[PDB]
Protein backbone atom coordinates (compact mmCIF):
# COMPACT_ATOMS: atom_id res chain seq x y z
CA UNK A 1 0.00 0.00 0.00
CA UNK A 2 3.13 2.15 -0.07
CA UNK A 3 2.89 3.41 -3.68
CA UNK A 4 -0.09 5.60 -2.76
CA UNK A 5 1.71 7.01 0.32
CA UNK A 6 4.81 8.08 -1.66
CA UNK A 7 5.28 11.51 -3.27
CA UNK A 8 8.23 12.32 -5.53
CA UNK A 9 8.75 14.95 -8.16
CA UNK A 10 11.36 16.14 -10.59
CA UNK A 11 11.63 19.83 -9.65
CA UNK A 12 13.78 20.84 -12.60
CA UNK A 13 15.79 19.27 -15.41
CA UNK A 14 17.96 20.71 -18.17
CA UNK A 15 20.63 19.87 -20.77
CA UNK A 16 23.72 21.33 -19.07
CA UNK A 17 26.54 20.79 -21.60
CA UNK A 18 27.42 18.43 -24.44
CA UNK A 19 24.67 15.76 -24.41
CA UNK A 20 24.26 15.60 -20.64
CA UNK A 21 20.92 16.11 -18.88
CA UNK A 22 20.69 16.86 -15.15
CA UNK A 23 17.45 16.26 -13.21
CA UNK A 24 16.72 17.14 -9.58
CA UNK A 25 14.62 14.41 -7.92
CA UNK A 26 12.88 15.62 -4.77
CA UNK A 27 11.19 13.46 -2.14
CA UNK A 28 8.18 15.58 -1.14
CA UNK A 29 6.35 12.84 0.75
CA UNK A 30 6.66 11.05 4.07
CA UNK A 31 8.26 7.73 3.01
CA UNK A 32 11.91 6.84 2.44
CA UNK A 33 12.87 5.82 -1.11
CA UNK A 34 15.16 2.75 -0.88
CA UNK A 35 17.70 1.41 -3.37
CA UNK A 36 17.65 4.52 -5.53
CA UNK A 37 20.37 3.15 -7.82
CA UNK A 38 18.07 0.22 -8.68
CA UNK A 39 15.51 2.58 -10.22
CA UNK A 40 14.53 2.32 -13.89
CA UNK A 41 15.01 5.37 -16.15
CA UNK A 42 13.61 6.05 -19.64
CA UNK A 43 14.36 9.09 -21.81
CA UNK A 44 13.52 10.31 -25.26
CA UNK A 45 11.78 12.64 -27.69
CA UNK A 46 8.23 12.84 -29.03
CA UNK A 47 6.83 10.10 -26.81
CA UNK A 48 9.35 7.47 -27.94
CA UNK A 49 11.56 6.68 -24.96
CA UNK A 50 14.76 4.65 -24.65
CA UNK A 51 15.80 2.67 -21.55
CA UNK A 52 18.71 4.34 -19.75
CA UNK A 53 21.01 1.89 -17.92
CA UNK A 54 22.41 2.68 -14.48
CA UNK A 55 26.14 3.46 -14.77
CA UNK A 56 26.25 0.86 -17.53
CA UNK A 57 29.38 1.89 -19.45
CA UNK A 58 27.53 2.87 -22.65
CA UNK A 59 25.23 5.82 -23.49
CA UNK A 60 22.49 6.50 -22.67
CA UNK A 61 23.25 5.82 -19.00
CA UNK A 62 22.61 7.60 -15.72
CA UNK A 63 24.38 8.17 -12.41
CA UNK A 64 23.40 9.29 -8.90
CA UNK A 65 25.56 9.48 -5.79
CA UNK A 66 22.92 8.51 -3.17
CA UNK A 67 21.31 5.09 -2.85
CA UNK A 68 18.33 6.33 -0.83
CA UNK A 69 16.06 9.36 -0.75
CA UNK A 70 14.78 10.41 2.68
CA UNK A 71 11.63 12.58 2.98
CA UNK A 72 12.56 16.15 2.10
CA UNK A 73 15.79 15.29 0.29
CA UNK A 74 16.72 16.13 -3.29
CA UNK A 75 19.37 14.38 -5.41
CA UNK A 76 21.01 15.19 -8.72
CA UNK A 77 20.49 12.54 -11.42
CA UNK A 78 22.82 12.85 -14.41
CA UNK A 79 21.86 11.34 -17.78
CA UNK A 80 24.53 10.89 -20.45
CA UNK A 81 22.81 10.88 -23.82
CA UNK A 82 23.96 9.26 -27.04
CA UNK A 83 22.31 11.86 -29.29
CA UNK A 84 22.27 15.66 -28.98
CA UNK A 85 18.97 17.25 -28.05
CA UNK A 86 16.99 19.05 -30.75
CA UNK A 87 15.36 22.37 -29.95
CA UNK A 88 12.42 21.34 -32.15
CA UNK A 89 11.44 18.25 -30.11
CA UNK A 90 10.07 17.76 -26.61
CA UNK A 91 11.82 15.25 -24.33
CA UNK A 92 10.49 13.14 -21.46
CA UNK A 93 12.29 11.73 -18.42
CA UNK A 94 10.47 8.77 -16.89
CA UNK A 95 11.62 7.12 -13.66
CA UNK A 96 10.21 4.08 -11.86
CA UNK A 97 11.64 3.86 -8.36
CA UNK A 98 11.97 0.47 -6.63
CA UNK A 99 8.65 0.62 -4.73
CA UNK A 100 6.96 1.07 -8.13
CA UNK A 101 6.27 4.82 -7.90
CA UNK A 102 6.58 6.57 -11.28
CA UNK A 103 7.66 10.18 -11.85
CA UNK A 104 8.10 12.09 -15.10
CA UNK A 105 9.20 15.47 -16.43
CA UNK A 106 9.02 17.02 -19.89
CA UNK A 107 11.13 19.84 -21.30
| Phi, psi (deg, nearest 5) at residue 38 | -95, 5
Method: X-ray
Compute the distance between CA of residue 20 and CA of residue 62 in angstroms, rounded to an integer: 10
Domain locations in the chain as residue ranges: 1-107
Q: What is the resolution of this structure in A?
A: 1.9
CB 27 within 8 A of CB 72: yes
- The DSSP bridge partners found for residue 41 are 52, 95
**What is the DSSP secondary structure assignment for residue 95, as one 8-state letter?**
E
Cβ(36)–Cβ(69) below 8 Å: yes
Cα–Cα distance, 32 to 6 (Å, whole number): 8
Strands (E), the chain: 8-17, 20-27, 33-34, 40-45, 50-54, 61-63, 68-69, 74-80, 91-96, 102-106
- Are the CB atoms for 77 and 36 separated by under 8 Å? no
Query: Hey, is 10 helix, strand or coil?
Result: strand
Q: Distance between CA 98 and CA 107 in Å, rounded?
A: 24
Amino acid sequence: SQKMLTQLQIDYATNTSSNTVVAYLHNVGETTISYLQNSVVYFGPNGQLQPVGYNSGSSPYWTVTSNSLQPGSVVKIIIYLSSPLSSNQYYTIQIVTPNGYTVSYMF
